[PDB]
């Protein structure tokens, strides 16, 4: 039921010049991702695997977006809560894939540059759908981040990345947390979107300087809730609350993350029918546990690097999708 994407980055400038070979071939048609394992284009062995859907590297921000996002946005839009993971070692394109990247030299403005990714997409199409048809609606964003199982907010413009978050149980709701001092922002039109995301890529450098490795070993939870109140053409008032996470995951290379090695165990778990899954033993698994074998529809991009240095890397990534397929909720 989880439905699990993988997508191949294309070779750098460093890897052209030094005219490298691609052990990795994708089969979209076929949903289909073959790894060279032995060696030799001209004789060679090879393992496949088969998703739900394979991008290779020709594959854009905009086939990204259309092809996986739309559709999940559109259950946000109708009131459900909708999970997306990025998986995959560093460097081939977690935070490429969930927020994308500015073109270089002033080229575009935010909203038209063509590298952007889910998160800059996803909050301009949510203020691009919901201001034509008749509908009121709030839209709240949240970014919450954990490092070495402390929890950080990485959008509150009054406090600094030093200050970790509590994380409680909800005695409401069971299996949900608290997050005591969780800010989030209201965002008030699409042109109040991007400040937004740079105040937040900001204050991630300062969190960069003050933790080792920062941006490989963190693990972010980009939230967007959307309160709405839609009145259809007749006189119907429909109110809907959704809420996307958007989780750009650690990178998953191999000191001990604990909400990484938590999320493996939790996935080991739903997928072998083992009756106690281990949310609780990290932060991650415990606030998006809904995500994990409950009500939520969550799916789960895993990244991937097309250079036989990664072969290793890359199996292991592909090994570890596919298992999580497996996984049933709702
Ligand atoms: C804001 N920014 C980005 O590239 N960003 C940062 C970013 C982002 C930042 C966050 F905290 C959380 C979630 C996010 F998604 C995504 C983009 C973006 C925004 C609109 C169009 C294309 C890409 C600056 C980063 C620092 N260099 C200049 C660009
Ligand atoms: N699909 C892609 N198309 C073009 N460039 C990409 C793509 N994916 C990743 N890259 C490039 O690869 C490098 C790895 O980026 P990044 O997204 O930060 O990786 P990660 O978050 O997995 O550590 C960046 O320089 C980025 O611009
Ligand atoms: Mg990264």
Known sequence: ????????????????????????????????????????????????????????????????????????????????????????????????????????????????????????????????????????????????????????????????????????????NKRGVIIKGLEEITVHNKDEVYQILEKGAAKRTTAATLMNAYSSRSHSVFSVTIHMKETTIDGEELVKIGKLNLVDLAGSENNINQSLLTLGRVITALVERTPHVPYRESKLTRILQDSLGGRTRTSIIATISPASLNLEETLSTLEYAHRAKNILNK
Request: with cysteine; glycine share 6%; hydrophobic share 35%.
């Open 1 to 172: 039921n989880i439905q699990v994407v993988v997508r191949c980055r294309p070779f750098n400038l460093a890897e052209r010049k030094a005219s490298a070979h691609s052990i990795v071939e994708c089969d979209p048609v076929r949903k289909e991702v073959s790894v060279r394992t032995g060696g030799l284009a001209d004789k060679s062995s090879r393992k496949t695997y088969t998703f739900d859907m394979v991008f290779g590297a020709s594959t854009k921000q905009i086939d990204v977006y259309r092809s996986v996002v739309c559709p999940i946005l559109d259950e946000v839009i109708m009131g459900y809560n909708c999970t997306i993971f990025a998986y995959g070692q560093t460097g081939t394109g977690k935070t490429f894939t969930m927020e994308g990247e500015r073109s270089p030299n002033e080229e575009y403005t935010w909203e038209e540059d063509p590298l952007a990714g889910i998160i800059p997409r996803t909050l301009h199409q949510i203020f691009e759908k919901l201001t034509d048809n008749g509908t009121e609606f709030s839209v709240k964003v949240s970014l919450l981040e954990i490092y070495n199982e402390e929890l950080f907010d990485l959008l509150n413009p009054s406090s600094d990345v030093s200050e970790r978050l509590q994380m409680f149980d909800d005695p409401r």
